[PDB]
Amino acid sequence: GHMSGDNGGGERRKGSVKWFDTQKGFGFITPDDGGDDLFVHQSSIRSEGFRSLAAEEAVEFEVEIDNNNRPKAIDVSGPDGAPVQGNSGGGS
């Protein structure tokens, strides 16, 4: 059948970036309402266009557990869940 011990993908969380390094190729988010820091990088940002995070920045995201069993943060947006213009576009 369909495993559903969670929301069926990545459960919503909030936090603040520990650091986003494009050189290292990895970053981490400290979840404000969670425990373990979640891995975050460009491919986990809510942006399909311009996707990058600022080290000290606060964020709202979904936390998804990677195949390494380490939970990672994706669909990263502002702390209020506010989308950035670089997410896709919009026009306004």
Q: Is residue 15 part of a domain?
A: yes
Q: Is residue 6 part of a domain?
A: no
Overall number of domains in the chain: 1
Residue 10: strand, helix, or coil: coil
Q: Is residue 92 part of a domain?
A: no
Per the structure block, which two tokens stand in for 77?
């947006």
Question: What string of DSSP letters covers 20-71?
Answer: EETTTTEEEEEESSSSS-EE--GGGBS-SSS----TT-EEEEEEEE-TTS-E
Write out the residue range of the structural domain in which residue 55 sits: 11-82
Q: CATH code at 48?
A: 2.40.50.140
How close are the terminal C-alpha atoms of the chain, in Å? 42
Q: Is residue 89 part of a domain?
A: no
Backbone angles phi, psi at 74, to 5 degrees: -135, 170
Tokens 């669909």 found at? 75
